[PDB]
Amino acid sequence: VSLRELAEKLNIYIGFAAINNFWSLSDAEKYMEVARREFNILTPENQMKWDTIHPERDRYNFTPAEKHVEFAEENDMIVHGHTLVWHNQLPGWITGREWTKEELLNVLEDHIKTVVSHFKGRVKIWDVVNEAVSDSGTYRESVWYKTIGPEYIEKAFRWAKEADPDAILIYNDYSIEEINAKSNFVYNMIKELKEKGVPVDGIGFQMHIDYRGLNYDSFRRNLERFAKLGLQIYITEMDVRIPLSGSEEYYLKKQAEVCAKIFDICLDNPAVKAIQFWGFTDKYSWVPGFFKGYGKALLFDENYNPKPCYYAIKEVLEKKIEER
C-alpha cells in the first residue's frame, strides 16, 4: 500500500523533486526504487532550469532533463516542468550583459518556445513563472521585471501555451499558502491575468514550512479563493523542517501532525490536483544548507526508512478513500 497507490484511488498525484543526476548517485538503485514505489509525479529539481538546459545563448542541452522524463515515463509518472522564468540560477550570458526590453523579450520567447516545444506532450505541468512577487507584496525586481516591466509574466504564459496548448501552466511561489500581503498580491495578479485571457491554468504553493505548521483556517480560505478563480491547485515543493538539536522524537511528532493536517485540508478541496515534496529522503535535501539549524524535513530518513510523517500521511489518505 504505497502512497501512489492511494493517490491513484483519490484521483490525485503524490510525488517528489528529483535530484541532479539521480541515475549516477552512489545509491542510485535504492533512490530510484523508493521513488518508483511511492510516487506518480516527478519534478526535476534543477536540470530543467536555465543554466543547465540553455547554457549558452544559441545552445541547448536537453540531455539531463530527458533522463528525468525517461525515468518518469518508464515508471508511470507524469512530469512537472520547472521552471521557465526565474531570477536565480540564470546563466552568465544573461546576467553578464545589459539588456533592452525588446532584446530580453526575444530571448525569453525563444527560451520558452524552444523548451516547451521540445517536451510537448511529455511534460503535463509547467511552472511558467516562479517567485515573481517580492516578500513585501510587490513585483520582484528581477532582471526580467526591471528590463521588461510586468508584461513579461503575461507573455511567458502566452508563449508557453502556444508551444504546448495541452500543458497545464501554473504560477509557483513560496509563503503564499496563507492569506497575507504576498498571497493577496498574487491573487489579484492572477485574477487580472485570467481576466485578459492569459492562460494561467493553476497555482503552485511551494509549502516550504516548519514543524509549527500554518494557520490552517487561513490556508483553507486561501485555497478556496484561488480555486474559485478557476485554477487547478498544486502543492509543489513541500518540506517541514525541524530543529536539529532538541528532542527529535517531539519534532518528528509535530512534523507528522503538520503533514496530516495539510493533506487533510488539501484533499477536502477538489481543486488540489497534486502534492509533492521537495525531495523525499533527508539524505538528499536542500533544507540543511538553506535553513541554518534545521533539517530532517522529508518523508524518509537518511537510510530510506519511513518517518512518522510518512505513516501519518498514509493514514489520512486511507481515511479519505474509505469516507468516499
Ligand SMILES: O[C@@H]1[C@@H](O)[C@@H](O[C@@H]2CO[C@@H](O)[C@H](O)[C@H]2O)OC[C@H]1O
Ligand atoms: O540549488 C537548488 C536550490 O535552488 C533549491 O531549489 C529551489 C528552492 O527554492 C524554490 O523556491 C525553487 O523553486 C527551487 O528551484 O533546492 C534544490 C537545490 O538543488
